[PDB]
Amino acid sequence: SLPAHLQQTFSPEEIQFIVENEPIKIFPRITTRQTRWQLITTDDKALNNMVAMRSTEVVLWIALLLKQQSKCSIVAPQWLTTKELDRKIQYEKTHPDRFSELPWNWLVLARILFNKAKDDFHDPIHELRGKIQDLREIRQIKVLKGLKYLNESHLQLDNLSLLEINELRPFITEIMDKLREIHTASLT
Amino acid sequence: FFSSYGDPCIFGSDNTLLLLSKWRSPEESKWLPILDSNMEIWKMSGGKETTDIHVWPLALAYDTLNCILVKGKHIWPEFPLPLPSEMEIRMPVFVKSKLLEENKEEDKEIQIPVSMAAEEEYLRSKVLSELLTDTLENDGEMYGNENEVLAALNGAYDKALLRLFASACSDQNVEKALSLAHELKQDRALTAAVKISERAELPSLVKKINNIREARYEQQLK
Amino acid sequence: DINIDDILAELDKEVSPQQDFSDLMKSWKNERCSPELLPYPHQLMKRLLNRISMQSQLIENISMGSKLPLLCMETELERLKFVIRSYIRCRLSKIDKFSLYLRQLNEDENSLISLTDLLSKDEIKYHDTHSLIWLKLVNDSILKYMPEELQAINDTEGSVNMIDEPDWNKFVFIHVNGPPDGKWNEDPLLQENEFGKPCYTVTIPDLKEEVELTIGSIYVMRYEVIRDLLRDDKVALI
Incomplete structure (x- = not known):
């Protein structure tokens, strides 16, 4: 019935779909305030009451839908700037086991905004693309150290992103399950 | 430029924003300093002198400045046009040395005494409410809801005064606390001031506030 | 020094279509990962399906009556329908794998939960008739030839348990x-x-x-x- 590759996990398309439901801040280039939108899964007042160059908050999928056309501009999140990413890299280097406290959707949102909204950043984009890479590489080192503690009981993780978890899910759970089977078989 | 409600405004070579108030009444018309850009960048930088940063103003929307933040040699923007920013006005009340002493990750914006924050809010609320009131008195509402903003400003005004009042009561300065109590508007706030006086264990001030509340209740009955 | 933050709080203070979708997302994500079949949200689904019907008729009426609001409405309805489609397909896939277990759970008179509590009416129909189709196929093809001790399909007592x-x-x-x-x-x-x-x-x-x-x-x-x-x-x- 359901496809074989969706029995236990989410595909990256579903991960993008999940991230798209979050709110984001925009500057509209038109006034809607005095037809009306009449949505059923969100607030409707914000879109009906827009005024040009007045900041407002909407779901990300509608924000990208507007930015497709002239009608809108997207404000970048404050963590997505050179100063903050510098500090997070320094945190990563300083604490050789803890993960730095980046938001749960950082990879997905960065790789959406760099494609759909390359024109709306303040920093030069060719530097952000480097610092995002540095963060992902350091985190991958820390992941490879952690896979030596798979065990029969449990594990704790902190600040690991959704896409990063979903990348690893079928390996961690499978090896952990087999260690559990081997151990309990000796008890019985 | 003119404000979003027709007030005359100008930005000085000192990088300060000035607005002309009470222009409808020549014996009351006066110039007001409502925002210093340099003080904002100083706090934003963690109390540092990032003179490489410059502010280019665009227009005034109610309480918020539209502006470009320019970096580098030349203190004005270039092409293609960078995106604008938004920034709120605040009253000039602070001191660098005092705030450094109060403050005493490396660029973290400096922490401020609650007294300064409440004082600045009460002044800002007062000025904003007066300007909005003058606008409504002469030109009315454009949109049908601005009175609600004025009500919110009055609430913020009493709220700020209550914090300052409570500080005076905690200091046991009954004279200053009583003088502050005259400036509160709603009897809700005066009732809260009575509770605050009870916590301060000032029955004399509870008495005199209730005298004021009774006097103002009589004035409300008249 | 005197605290007043509580005084200020008490001084100062003097179901929706948005929430249902969050509950749907929650249910979808939990159903995908968990090993058991979780109980059906009976009330939520009734309200959601009614809302879908009304929104469809509204879109038709406005279409027959700026383009962009219609764009938003149409694609929102697509986004809503996809989640429900995926969720129901997952539940039916779970019912395929645990059919004999659910039947045994229902046949137990002492069970703490009834099968109709767990499943929707459509799911009940699917489970019942699919079990008969599968049973007829193996009963005629294989089990017709076995001796009477081995003709049971849901045997627990054999050398391997036939129920998953x-x-x-x-x-x-x-x-x-x-x-x-x-x-x-x-x-x-x-x-x-x-x-x-x-x-x-x-x-x-x-x-x-x-x-x-x-x-x-x-x-x-x-x-x-x-x-x-x-x-x-x-x-x-x-």
Whole structure:
């Protein structure tokens, strides 16, 4: 019935779909305030009451839908700037086991905004693309150290992103399950 | 430029924003300093002198400045046009040395005494409410809801005064606390001031506030 | 010095279509990962399907009557329908795999839950008739030839158990939410660690060991150990 590759996990398309439901801040280039939108899964007042160059908050999928056309501009999140990413890299280097406290959707949102909204950043984009890479590489080192503690009981993780978890899910759970089977078989 | 409600405004070579108030009444018309850009960048930088940063103003929307933040040699923007920013006005009340002493990750914006924050809010609320009131008195509402903003400003005004009042009561300065109590508007706030006086264990001030509340209740009955 | 933050708080203070979709997302994500078949949300689905019908008619009326609002409405209805489609397909796939187990659970007169509590009416129809189709196929083809001791299809007593059931000890990823209302002082299970966040405590019985599940930290945990907290929405599956 359901496809074989969706029995236990989410595909990256579903991960993008999940991230798209979050709110984001925009500057509209038109006034809607005095037809009306009449949505059923969100607030409707914000879109009906827009005024040009007045900041407002909407779901990300509608924000990208507007930015497709002239009608809108997207404000970048404050963590997505050179100063903050510098500090997070320094945190990563300083604490050789803890993960730095980046938001749960950082990879997905960065790789959406760099494609759909390359024109709306303040920093030069060719530097952000480097610092995002540095963060992902350091985190991958820390992941490879952690896979030596798979065990029969449990594990704790902190600040690991959704896409990063979903990348690893079928390996961690499978090896952990087999260690559990081997151990309990000796008890019985 | 003119404000979003027709007030005359100008930005000085000192990088300060000035607005002309009470222009409808020549014996009351006066110039007001409502925002210093340099003080904002100083706090934003963690109390540092990032003179490489410059502010280019665009227009005034109610309480918020539209502006470009320019970096580098030349203190004005270039092409293609960078995106604008938004920034709120605040009253000039602070001191660098005092705030450094109060403050005493490396660029973290400096922490401020609650007294300064409440004082600045009460002044800002007062000025904003007066300007909005003058606008409504002469030109009315454009949109049908601005009175609600004025009500919110009055609430913020009493709220700020209550914090300052409570500080005076905690200091046991009954004279200053009583003088502050005259400036509160709603009897809700005066009732809260009575509770605050009870916590301060000032029955004399509870008495005199209730005298004021009774006097103002009589004035409300008249 | 005198505190007034509570005085200011008491001075100052003087179901929706948005919420249903969040509940749907929650149900979808939990159903995908968990090893058992979770109970159907009977009320939520009724309200959602009615809303879908009304929105469809509204879109038709406005179309027959700027382009962009219609664009938003149309694609929103697509986004809503996709989630429900995926969710129902997953549940039917679970019913295929545990058909004999669900039938045995229903036949047990002493069961603490009835099959109609767990499944929707459409799911009941599918389960019942699909079992008969599969039964007819193997009964005629294979079992017609076997001796009478081996003709049963759901035999428990043979040298291998013919009934499959969920792996209650499957490992799953979890994220600790706490009580939904923010009522940390009211939750009776929510104790506190030293100089930090509140936490829950669970006992893993094969090993006779305990762990502390702090609010906000992520874990890889056995399913049965965390089943009760999941049912109470203290945690959510990642």
